């Protein structure tokens with residue numbers, strides 16, 4: 001089966017659909033139907049552990065997104081966070097500070113470039129190798 | 133006891149008097165590791181901030197989190213705290229009109245991780261109940 005990708009965002013919808021649509025080129029997006037409480041917590045936890053990579057849109061402040069990122073770090077997951085400074089917000093220091101430039105990355109982006117940034121991210125460290 | 137008070141930067145401005153009341157009450161039970169962060173007008177290095185909060189979180193006997201304001205930082209600290217199996221109390225005000233994230237309400241096991249809905253006037257009596 002294809003790699004499993006976890007898309008994390010705040011429960012924007014047009015941008016989230018573009019992110020999920022692009023990530024489907026790299027594998028199954030486990031949270032695709034969520035994008036489209038104990039039971040919810042358990043299901044997201046099951047999917048986070050299954051994920052090969054966690055891609056989180058962290059522009060909208062969310063306790064849920066933050067919590068899933070904290071659990072993901074504790075699971076030693078490969079994490080990419082996407083933040084849009086054009087929102088006007090200052091990203092939480094806890095999320096910027098968690099970055100280590102390798103396993104946990106935080107990229108500031110402009111809405112128009114998100115598809116190109118996701119291709120860049122998987123070209124540098126693919127989940128499936130390219131054909132010859 | 134070492135007590136970790138977890139609140140949001142936004143809540144530290146909009147709920148300043150309420151955060152001061154919570155920190156003041158918590159001091160009757162032990163040392164509040166984050167007292168100086170709550171007293172500050174909120175950055176000095178995001179990695180330094182992350183490492184400091186993570187050191188205090190690791191050392192804490194109990195984490196008391198005010199989760200009424202959505203915050204990626206408060207969510208992240210709660211996710212790291214659950215991975216450490218910290219004893220956690222989350223305080224949420226439904227009069228705010230907010231719907232607390234399913235991820236936070238769903239993390240409750242009702243004993244180790246508890247989430248209490250409250251009205252601001254009763255917070256001192258509720259913290260006395262919790263530590264009694």
Ligand SMILES: CNc1nc(Nc2ccc(C(=O)O)cc2-c2cccc(C(F)(F)F)c2F)nc2ccc(C(C)C)cc12
Nearest residue numbers: 007008009010011031034035040043062064065233234235
């Ligand atoms: C509210 N319903 C369900 N939420 C969730 N996760 C959340 C919970 C809270 C938060 C928050 O911002 O606090 C955000 C999320 C969330 C996580 C990943 C992606 C997205 C996306 F942005 F893509 F949509 C999210 F919103 N997981 C689910 C998993 C199964 C089911 C049923 C099918 C069983 C229901 C749910």
Ligand SMILES: CNc1nc(Nc2ccc(C(=O)O)cc2-c2cccc(C(F)(F)F)c2F)nc2ccc(C(C)C)cc12
Nearest residue numbers: 092093094137138139140141144166169170176203205206
């Ligand atoms: C922003 N500055 C500093 N933040 C923090 N933690 C945060 C980071 C982000 C968030 C967020 O909501 O996203 C919230 C917190 C936070 C954590 C616990 C208590 C509070 C309280 F509400 F009580 F105030 C918090 F706000 N730790 C620090 C630790 C040392 C220093 C020195 C420079 C003085 C600075 C800081």
